Design a binder for this molecule. Sequence first.
Ligand SMILES: [Zn+2]
Length: 146
Amino acid sequence: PRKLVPLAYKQFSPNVPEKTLGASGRYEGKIARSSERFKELTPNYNPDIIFKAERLMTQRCKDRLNSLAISVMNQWPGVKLRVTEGWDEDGHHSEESLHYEGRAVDITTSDRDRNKYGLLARLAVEAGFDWVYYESKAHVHCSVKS
Ligand SMILES: [Zn+2]
């Protein structure tokens, strides 16, 4: 067994830029409702995840999130994974955010205990998200390749 080490504030894993090939890969452009690429987005209705649209994400993102949902409930009995941002149609992030193509989620615990977020980030990496960034005290940013 291995010690699960929480990510530090502002740490990202792996320790490379999000868009690198060993991470979540290149930005592919915004996905609009009208896009053909919009049909690669699937809604996530996992009853074990709290959703603050936020539900629309790629299959790989869905798989990683659902895996995380289990691990969080294990880590903290009685607590659930919570999503506060998923697919963004409204330019609320940087120039080229993976949020714009349904390949990123910002997450917390259901109890909004910010002291848990570093460990939540570690669980996200263990759950297979291709890039995990303890971006803010308000949430952890998790993304996947396409
Ligand atoms: Zn984010």
